[PDB]
């Protein structure tokens, strides 16, 4: 909202949009972390020194 009337009045809109995106980003990040932990566990023993 407010696609250009004041430098500050446009900062809020992008701020809110990014803040909303952040939750989805965090969920996907958690999924990736879980995959990585499983991969580490498998590397622990299936792989040779």
């Amino acid at each position: 909202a407010a696609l250009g009337d004041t430098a500050t009045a446009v900062r809020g809109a992008l701020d809110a949009a990014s803040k909303r995106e952040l939750g989805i980003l965090r969920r996907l990040s958690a999924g990736i972390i879980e995959i990585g932990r499983k991969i580490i566990a498998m590397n622990a023993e299936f792989l040779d020194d």
Binding site: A13, A17, R20, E21
Partner: protein, 48 residues
């Protein structure tokens, strides 16, 4: 012939006039969709 001036005797059809409500309705729907999703997409106009 007299009694029939060309400005009324001849007529060249053109496109009709779009009423001022369709524009408003499209704008309303697009704004609602943008609010729902949360991504402005820099759209409904020039991508810039």
């Amino acid at each position: 012939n007299p009694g029939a001036d060309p400005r009324a005797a001849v007529h060249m059809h053109t496109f009709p006039e779009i009423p001022q409500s369709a524009q408003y309705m499209i704008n309303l729907q697009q704004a609602e969709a943008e609010s729902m999703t949360g991504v402005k997409a820099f759209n409904a106009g020039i991508s810039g």
